[PDB]
Design a protein around this ligand. Sequence first.
Ligand SMILES: *C(=O)[C@@H](NC(=O)/C(=N/OC)c1csc(N)n1)[C@@H]1N=C(C(=O)O)C(=C)CS1
Length: 252
Amino acid sequence: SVNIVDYSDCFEGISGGAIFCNTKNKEYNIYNKELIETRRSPCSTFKIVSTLIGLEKGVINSKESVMGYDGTDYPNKNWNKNLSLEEAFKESCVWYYKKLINKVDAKSVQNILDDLKYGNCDISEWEGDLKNGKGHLNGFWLESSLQISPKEQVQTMAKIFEGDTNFKKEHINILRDIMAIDVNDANINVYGKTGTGFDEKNKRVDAWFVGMLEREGDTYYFAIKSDDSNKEITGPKVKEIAINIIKKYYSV
Ligand SMILES: *C(=O)[C@@H](NC(=O)/C(=N/OC)c1csc(N)n1)[C@@H]1N=C(C(=O)O)C(=C)CS1
């Protein structure tokens, strides 16, 4: 049952949409359908999938795993160290995940995205959007060739976390561990990942919060996405919108 809902009150005037889906039943809750079906760059929400890829290929092994920091200077102080998978994920550290993915052959990534039905599965622009001048701080998942809709994000999440892929449960559980977020509410478990990008073509943000909600035996897989024209609208902002929706509409 697809129910069209209105979560405009939690968006505080920001343009976007949301999709929550419970697979135990078939409750699909959709705010702004056109947007929910529209493919965009996943941005850093792809770090959910790239983490599983690195674990599956044995590039990394646990939430402590390191990628061999070489001392390069970065403006974010937390990038300037041999950080663990948990920290790189939570800091959304780009050099860590770029080095990780560049240890995997492209055909393995193609096959994994295909299996996950990950949007357009287009990794043709492997090095990413080089015209932004950022060089090696780029990749196919950052405002580049790969694109996925909020609906497909939710479907991918459900496939992964319901056990419907060949990824090892041990690796799934590492992801659950590092995806958990503190929502000041112990009656629900919230997991997710932000993403932030700007579509220079359309002059709109791609701001994401994608994840899952556990609330008394029921699990909801969700994706919240803004396409606002205001450049101040980021992943973290959209995560706050997501948390407001969860507290207002997915409590009990
Ligand atoms: C993933 O989406 C990352 N975003 C970027 O690569 C950006 N790089 O440019 C500085 C970016 C930041 S603002 C903008 N228009 N582009 C990392 N993920 C976000 C996130 O998690 O939402 C961050 C919090 C840090 S950057």
